[PDB]
């Protein structure tokens, strides 16, 4: 692919394949020319080397390196290990409708609630806002709805307030060691950029407010929303699944 600045950027595989093709096509030439057998041999070894590099580089011997010194990334490296397909892109994924911020206390909150910054919530619920805008007849089209939310009009705040009622959101803190590291709450919209977390579930998150941050996720479907409110809501999940003990305890 071309970078903006007229540079090109390519996969290492292309370099590896260029080696193989060149060596194989040279072999065909050497055979057409009926070359002496020692040269035929060297080329056959050459071919095997390049193929081995293509499939799994640093397996048989010295991995074939770039100008950077670093061994080129072969096919097997894309399947193999943490950088590999499975671990990195398949068993765990990047996710839309996800946000993050600093967390701070919400002593006023009840157990099933969390402070959700307005700005953040406006973006997370974008399509829900556009859909409701079209039912209000406020937005003629999607382009108009978009421009209406950019301008952040006062009717949009009323609509946003409407949508987020009864809609659970998931809060997560890293590392997610047990299931209670992800819990669902009813969001309470707040002006100001930090998430407010309820004190009593700080236990389960191991959250202390020395600058800790948390991630927010929007359950989209009726099914996911139900899963969140029923299975994952903080009020519903009190006891440690490990020992039969209440994990929400005053501290």
């Amino acid at each position: 692919v071309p970078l903006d600045g007229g540079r090109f950027a390519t996969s290492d595989l292309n370099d590896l394949y260029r080696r193989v093709i060149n060596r194989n096509n040279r072999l065909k030439r050497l055979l057409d020319l009926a070359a002496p057998d020692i040269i035929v041999r060297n080329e056959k070894r050459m071919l095997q080397e390049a193929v081995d590099a293509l499939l799994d580089n640093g397996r048989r011997g010295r991995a074939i390196t770039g100008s950077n010194k670093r061994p080129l990334k072969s096919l097997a490296d894309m399947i193999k290990g943490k950088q590999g397909r499975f671990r990195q892109n398949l068993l765990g994924k990047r996710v839309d409708y996800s946000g993050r911020s600093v967390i701070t206390v919400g002593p006023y909150l009840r157990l099933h609630q969390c402070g959700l910054p307005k700005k953040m919530a406006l973006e997370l619920f974008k399509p829900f806002i556009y859909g409701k805008l079209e039912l209000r007849g406020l937005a003629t089209t999607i382009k108009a709805a978009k421009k209406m939310v950019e301008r952040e009009e006062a009717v949009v705040w009323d609509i946003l307030d409407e949508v987020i009622r009864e809609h659970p959101v998931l809060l997560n803190r890293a590392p997610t060691l047990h299931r209670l590291g992800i819990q669902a709450f009813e969001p309470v919209l707040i002006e100001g950029k930090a998430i407010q977390l309820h004190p009593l579930v700080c236990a389960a998150y191991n959250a202390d407010f020395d600058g800790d941050q948390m991630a927010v996720h929007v359950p989209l479907t009726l099914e996911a929303q139900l899963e969140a409110r029923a299975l994952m809501m903080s009020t519903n999940n009190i006891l440690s699944p490990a020992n039969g003990e209440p994990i929400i305890v005053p501290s």
């Binding site: 399947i79 193999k80 290990g81 590999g84 499975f86 671990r87 398949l90 068993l91």
Partner: protein
């Protein structure tokens, strides 16, 4: 042991995704093994329903 028990499951997608993936795949490719996708791992990889 835990490591070998996971590698011993009939599901080769679960096995390969766990560890040892070059070896797991040569084993399965030679055996002509088929995974009918009973486990959660396997379903999550293909983005299906647990």
């Amino acid at each position: 042991g835990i490591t070998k028990a996971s590698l011993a499951t009939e599901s080769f997608i679960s096995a390969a995704s766990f560890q040892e993936t070059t070896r797991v795949l040569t084993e399965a490719a030679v055996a002509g093994k088929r995974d009918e996708l009973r486990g959660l791992k396997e379903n999550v990889i293909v983005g299906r329903l647990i």
